[PDB]
Design a protein around this ligand. Structure first.
Ligand code: SF4
Ligand SMILES: [Zn+2]
Ligand SMILES: [Zn+2]
Ligand SMILES: [Zn+2]
Ligand SMILES: [Zn+2]
Lengths: 82, 50, 339, 168, 512, 97, 158
């Protein structure tokens, strides 16, 4: 008659975590590194675009970037970074 | 000429028709309907209204 | 103040695109589930059940009320859908040829198709070929199935395969570990040892174990298709975006709108035909708390499979005379059939 | 619709010149100025929902049907007596009573049924079949009638002579 | 292979952004192609595709190759893409075997994709100098000591080198240099001209030009299973067996292939001398221990002879089989109960059997045992042989013997594991995203506190910046952090099962 | 409906749909077969390619993709018919020009 | 026997309590023997024997305890222990018949010993989707999602 609930109950419940220090350090180093390495220019976010109007503020707090330097002797011809 | 434009004599038969037309509904309308329908769904055929 | 509204856009159909739906897609489409074998209240009013078929939340079949979903009367209600779920998987009949083709084409141990990298290159090139046609797809199906069926070993995993054979209508088997005309490999000793306890407790197996075969069933087959390499998908000529090999097997059905099957006299073909399916499903459900033996279990499963097969069409041939079709029935195929 | 083009119509009735379906309305001697095309059936080819019923109860039903088919009388007597049997099979004492009382019950129901349709019959003809005894079935009859409070005619004097005299 | 794609895609987005990830996913779903058709499929500009593929080559998730008619394509690496979550364990391993220096080394190796020894040693030294004050510095000598130790142990190694393209195929060059590799110098270090110490940097000539190197992960993988077997034997009999197995394997490291089912036998004479002096076991007691171990019916190690002293051999494949069976036993046990483990172990030993033959052995009565067995079919752990008695094959005339297969079980279990991992990670990401308002507010107030924290400090900003609704909400963020910690721990506490499972599955293939 | 016994008008079998093409008339055929007989209007969602109702797509849970088409009612019946068999005729919509 | 059902088949019901207490107490005794034997801690080669209990020994112990008022039998107890191997708790060993009063095998006699599990509980069982009964349907696009699964979240709390 009445279809069951979306989540039927469970007799068992998951085993609790085991405590471990060097692992917890690693746990910390995981959350540190995932936020750290995103700086590496291998990571890419969108290029800057769609500015309102030229205001000399853009000259003063301008963003700086210089083109990346891969190994030009290992990849196919078109590898030039531009 | 119609029977031979494909480089082979294709008679007016359920077999010739399959070898001659491509759209789905006119196959499904003529004969071997369910077979054509299921095979078409299998292939994921698009079909234009042409 | 008001935001601009596009009132309408003159539009026209471009293409139809035929394809399959997954169990999860089927859930997402549905408005409600239906979980009852009965249809009317036992009272004098003959009112429909809420969670049984003919739920007016799914649509309308009368002149005196809207459906509880769209909220308007029969003159305009397009219709809606509900869905049901089986206890055990069952083949679709319509795609049964597809299932046997796929089981034939793939290596059982590792799910890959037994192709040479040269063959892979050739056929992916043909795939790249512009202007691919239906007929051409038939051609490639034929040629690749030919160059695969002649294989016995698998390059990938490092093992050989039997062959697929029917074991009666709606059922299928594979010839892996039978005794082989080329004489059995030493693994026959392992087969024999695996039967040791059964032989000791039941010697009547010994005359039989030499005739063993891969007793693949719908459940394991579905399980197998869950693990097909994505790279290997399109070479089955399936468009991966239209339908994926998981959906060739089913575990749920849509209950189509009432206006598809108006029931006034006050029965209809689809209506009670599907009542059969839901009743037998509840029967096997009760059986799941029964303490019963094995025979009736797999028998009830195959009964569900038979019932679905009927629910699609009616001219099925190979049924033994003990549960043959009881009368003519207009399944979907039969209402598209004929003048 | 409902209204005529603007004013006070609210009713709808059908009329049509020729093979059509238009909705008469009656504030204007009009058709709600709208009509709609009736949709209908046919050119193809009262409930189910049948309770499985207690085994002994349906045994009783089988006795009921087999009984009044002795009289080879209109099936409606069968159906209404069966309905009365279902109406009666709703009480603990009736359920707990020995089966002989149930057997005489399947006869008293037909008795009252025939009386409602003033179909001639007499106690002896019925009781010759049920292994019944005067005290048993008479007491059961009084119990059922006073339990259910049902009205029922009496044996009209001239009612029985017609069939009785024809038996000579 | 969906969950594979889901996991790898979300990880790739995590570590390289939602711009290259689409290229990566399409690549793994297409294998290899030239940039032309790739850009066509993605509908993406040439420059974007290039600035992705260059990175995917730097970390070698994709290769490149010149193909028939000279067309280059870039080949996806289906395992590389997903090894990454194992990096934690590599870092732990290096810091365990070695000091923090090895860990600072490896963290670089993977972060940059590749480096030349001059580059990596200089970079690590400079950042090392950041870790201490007072002009203290560390020389290149110690860094090179760790480096050569690692290379000798083959935990790190050289990249594939360019061929002699400067003096071959004169005229128009090939579209790509088609790098090559060789084992001859595969762990041979270069003599650098850079000398001295790390130097602190202004933040605003190469002798080892082109000599790049990368870690050898499989070396860790070999080491992981070594840990596994030694831990198993230590659990079962005693740590002394741990030491003797450790001795046998640390000599066997080079005596057999990394994936052979067995090793060549060492003599107990060699073991008796290779064992640590800290162990006082006598030769006769050592040999008697070895006889006991070879006598274990679990037979992880066998005798195989007696030439030149007691011969003994490790049987890796069976060991992996033992632990695979054990882990699957444990998962079924916890997921469904011990009784399940009992019935399972019956069917495992009694390879074919029927229900009416086990209830006595299982001692559980009817109307609970039979359905108990049946439901296991739903998850494919269980199989049934259904041998027919006749050419009729009717159900009334067949025997319903149960059956198992460990391979199918590991294969199927993989999907649940991968999907569960994806669930945890995407749950964290959802929770963070819906918390982005709160995260922004917290980070803003924390930056405000960081301002005038000690330099130019004043009291009028040290009690007001947390006075608002953040007071109860800060704990909400801390509770979010606790949930993050819980599931982050589950990650490290899931994938070791995965490691053993993939080891056991991969060794199963013969790859004819 | 069927015929004179129950008010059904006339039937125009295939063999007259053939003569209409013979002459080559197009607006006559279109009128006679879908305008006059059983014209009807339906609603679809472009995004998923599925049918909907009352200006809303239940599949995508959105409003900004639905639109209304003209259609012979028999073909709407057919599109609701196939889906039961798990053969899904998805739709791609386009400009009318 | 197919009619009687032994000392465990009672009034045509099953004496789950007797068999369960038998199992647990017999394992208690067996592991007590194993721990006390290895506490001798002299030599594994002597522990190969010391750690193993005799079936008559354990039968003598259990009937001496006399928890069940009904009698306890040789093969009945031996099978009671026989469940433990599949319980993953114990090990078996066989010797000549001269052990004990019975020598319960043809020219042989057999022993029993408690065993360590080879691994602790795995990581996966700590994951709610190691446990989540709709793991299959718990999809990001499905109405069962990690954003909405309720087990998924209660696992956060405890
Ligand atoms: S999201 Fe749902 S299915 Fe996934 S682990 Fe959490 S509770 Fe289980
Ligand atoms: Zn509606
Ligand atoms: Zn294979
Ligand atoms: Zn008026
Ligand atoms: Zn939509």
């Amino acid at each position: 008659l009445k279809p069951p609930p979306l989540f039927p109950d469970t007799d068992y419940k998951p085993v609790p975590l085991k405590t471990g220090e060097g692992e917890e350090y690693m746990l910390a180093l995981k959350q540190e590194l995932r936020e750290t390495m995103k700086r590496m220019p291998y990571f890419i976010e969108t290029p800057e675009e769609r500015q309102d109007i030229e205001r000399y503020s853009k000259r003063y707090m301008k963003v700086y970037k210089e083109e990346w330097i891969p190994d030009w002797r290992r990849l196919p011809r078109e590898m030039m970074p531009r | 000429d119609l029977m031979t434009y494909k480089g082979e004599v294709l008679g007016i038969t359920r077999f010739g028709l399959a070898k001659m037309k491509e759209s789905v509904l006119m196959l499904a309308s003529f004969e071997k309907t369910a077979d054509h329908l299921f095979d078409a769904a299998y292939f994921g055929q698009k079909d234009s209204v042409c | 103040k008001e935001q601009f509204r596009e009132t309408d856009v003159a539009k026209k159909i471009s293409h139809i695109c035929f394809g399959m739906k997954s169990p999860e897609e089927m859930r997402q489409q549905a408005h409600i589930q239906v979980v009852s074998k009965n249809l009317y209240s036992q009272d004098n009013q003959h009112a429909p059940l809420l969670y049984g078929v003919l739920d007016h939340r799914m649509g309308t079949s009368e002149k005196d009320r809207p459906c509880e979903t769209c909220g308007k009367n029969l003159a305009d209600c397009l219709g809606h859908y509900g869905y049901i779920d089986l206890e055990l998987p069952c083949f679709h009949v319509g795609y049964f040829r597809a299932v046997i083709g796929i089981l034939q084409m793939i290596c059982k141990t590792c799910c890959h198709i037994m192709l040479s990298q040269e063959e892979k290159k050739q056929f992916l090139d043909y795939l790249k070929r512009p202007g691919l046609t239906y007929l051409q797809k038939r051609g490639l199906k034929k040629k690749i199935s030919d160059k695969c069926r002649k294989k016995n070993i698998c390059h990938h995993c490092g093992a050989f395969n039997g062959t697929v054979k029917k074991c009666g209508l709606l059922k299928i088997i594979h010839e892996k570990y039978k005794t082989n005309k080329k004489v059995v490999d030493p693994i026959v000793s392992n087969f024999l040892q695996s039967f040791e306890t059964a032989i000791e407790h039941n010697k009547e197996v010994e005359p039989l174990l030499g005739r063993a075969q891969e007793n693949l069933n719908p459940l394991v087959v579905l399980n197998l298709f869950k693990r097909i390499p994505a790279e290997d998908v399109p070479l089955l000529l399936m468009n991966p975006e239209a339908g994926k090999p998981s959906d060739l097997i089913l575990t749920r059905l849509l209950v189509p709108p009432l206006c598809i099957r108006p029931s006034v006299v006050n029965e209809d073909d689809l209506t009670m035909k599907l009542t059969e399916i839901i009743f037998l499903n509840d029967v096997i459900k009760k059986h799941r708390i029964s303490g019963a033996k094995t025979q009736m279990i797999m028998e009830d499963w195959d009964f569900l499979q038979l019932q679905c097969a009927l629910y699609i069409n009616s001219e099925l041939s190979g049924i033994p005379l003990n549960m043959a079709p009881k009368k003519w029935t207009r399944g979907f195929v039969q209402r598209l059939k004929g003048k | 619709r409902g209204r005529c083009p603007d004013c006070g119509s609210t009713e709808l009735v059908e009329d049509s010149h020729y093979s059509q379906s238009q909705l008469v309305c009656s504030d204007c001697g009009c058709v709600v100025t709208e009509g709609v095309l009736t949709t209908t059936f046919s050119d193809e080819g009262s409930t189910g929902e049948n309770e499985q019923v207690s085994r002994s109860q349906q045994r009783g039903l089988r006795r009921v049907r087999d009984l009044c088919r002795v009289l080879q009388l209109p099936p409606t007597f069968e159906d209404t007596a069966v309905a009365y049997y279902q109406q009666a099979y709703r009480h603990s004492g009736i359920r707990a009573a020995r089966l002989q009382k149930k057997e005489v019950l399947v006869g008293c129901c037909v008795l009252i049924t025939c009386r409602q349709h003033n179909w001639p019959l007499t106690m002896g003809a019925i009781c010759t079949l049920l292994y019944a005894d005067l005290d048993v079935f008479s007491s059961t009859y009084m119990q059922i009638v006073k339990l259910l409070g049902l009205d029922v005619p009496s044996l009209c004097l001239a009612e029985l002579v017609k069939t009785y005299c024809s038996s000579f | 292979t969906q969950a594979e794609i889901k996991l790898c895609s979300l990880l790739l987005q995590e570590h390289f952004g939602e711009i290259v990830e689409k290229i990566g996913v399409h690549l793994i779903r297409t294998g290899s192609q030239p940039l032309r058709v790739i850009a066509h499929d993605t509908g993406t500009s040439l420059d974007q595709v290039k600035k992705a593929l260059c990175v995917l080559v730097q970390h070698n998730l994709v290769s490149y190759q010149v193909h028939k008619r000279g067309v280059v394509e870039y080949e996806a690496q289906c395992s590389r893409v997903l090894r990454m979550l194992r990096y934690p364990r590599y870092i732990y391993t290096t810091k365990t075997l070695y000091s923090d220096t090895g860990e600072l080394i490896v963290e670089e190796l993977l972060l940059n994709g590749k480096l030349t020894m001059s580059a990596v040693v200089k970079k690590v030294a400079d950042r090392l100098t950041e870790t201490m004050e007072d002009g203290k510095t560390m020389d290149y000598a110690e860094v090179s000591n760790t480096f050569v130790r690692l290379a000798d142990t083959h935990f790190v190694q050289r990249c594939p080198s360019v061929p002699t393209t400067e003096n071959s195929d004169p005229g128009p060059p090939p579209p790509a240099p088609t790098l090559v590799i060789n084992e001859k110098d595969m762990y041979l270090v270069p003599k650098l001209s850079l000398i001295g110490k790390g130097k602190r940097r202004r933040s605003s000539p190469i002798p080892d030009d082109g000599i790049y190197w990368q870690a050898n992960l499989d070396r860790f993988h070999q080491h992981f299973r070594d840990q596994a077997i030694v831990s198993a034997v230590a659990n079962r009999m005693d740590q002394t067996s741990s030491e003797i197995v450790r001795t046998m394997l640390r000599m066997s490291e080079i005596t057999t292939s990394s994936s052979a089912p067995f090793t060549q036998p060492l003599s107990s004479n060699e073991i008796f001398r290779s064992l640590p002096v800290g162990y006082n076991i006598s030769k006769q007691v050592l040999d008697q221990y070895l006889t006991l171990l070879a006598d274990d019916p679990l037979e992880f190690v066998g005798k195989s002879g007696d030439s030149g002293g007691g011969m003994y051999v490790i049987n890796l494949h069976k060991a992996l089989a033992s632990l695979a069976t054990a882990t699957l036993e444990s998962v079924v046990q916890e997921r469904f109960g011990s009784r399940c483990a009992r019935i399972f172990r019956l069917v495992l030993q009694k390879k074919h059997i029927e229900q009416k033959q086990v209830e006595d052995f299982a001692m559980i009565p009817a109307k609970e045992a039979k359905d108990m067995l049946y439901k296991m079919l739903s998850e494919n752990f269980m199989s049934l042989q259904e041998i027919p008695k006749t050419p009729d094959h009717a159900p009334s005339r067949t025997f319903y013997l149960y059956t198992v297969n460990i391979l199918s079980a590991a294969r199927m279990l993989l999907h649940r594991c991968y999907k569960s991992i994806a669930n945890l990670i995407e749950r964290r990401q959802f929770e963070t995203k819906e918390n982005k308002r709160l995260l922004e507010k917290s980070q803003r107030v924390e930056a405000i506190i960081a301002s005038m924290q000690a330099t130019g400090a004043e009291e009028a900003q040290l009690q007001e910046i947390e006075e608002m609704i953040t007071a109860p909400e800060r704990q909400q963020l801390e509770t979010l952090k606790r949930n993050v910690n819980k599931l982050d721990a589950s990650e490290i506490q899931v994938d070791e099962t995965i490691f053993l499972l993939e080891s056991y599955i991969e060794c199963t293939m013969k790859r004819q | 409906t069927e015929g004179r016994s129950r008010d059904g008008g006339l039937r125009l079998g295939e063999m007259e749909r053939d003569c209409l093409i013979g002459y080559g008339a197009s607006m006559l055929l279109l009128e006679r077969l879908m305008i006059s007989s059983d014209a009807f209007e339906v609603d679809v969602c472009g995004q998923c390619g599925l049918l909907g109702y009352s200006g809303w797509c239940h599949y995508c849970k959105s409003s900004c993709h639905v639109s209304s088409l003209r259609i012979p009612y028999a073909c709407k019946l057919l599109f609701q018919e196939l889906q039961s068999m798990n053969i899904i005729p998805r739709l791609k919509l386009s400009k009318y020009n | 026997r197919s009619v009687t059902g032994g000392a465990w088949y009672s009034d045509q019901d099953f004496e789950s309590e007797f068999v369960e207490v038998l199992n647990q107490q017999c394992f208690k005794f067996l592991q007590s023997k194993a721990e006390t034997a290895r506490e001798s801690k002299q030599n594994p080669m002597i522990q190969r024997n010391s750690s193993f209990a005799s079936s008559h020994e354990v039968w003598k112990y259990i009937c001496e305890l006399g928890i069940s008022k009904v009698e306890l039998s040789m093969e009945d107890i031996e099978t009671i222990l026989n469940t433990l191997i599949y319980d993953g708790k114990v090990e078996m060993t066989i010797i000549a018949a001269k052990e004990g009063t019975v020598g319960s095998v043809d020219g042989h006699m057999k022993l029993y010993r408690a065993v360590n599990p080879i691994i602790p509980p795995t990581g996966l069982v700590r994951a709610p989707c190691g446990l989540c009964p709709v793991f299959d349907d718990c999809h990001e696009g499905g109405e069962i999602s990690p954003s909405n699964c309720i087990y998924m979240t209660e696992w956060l709390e405890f």
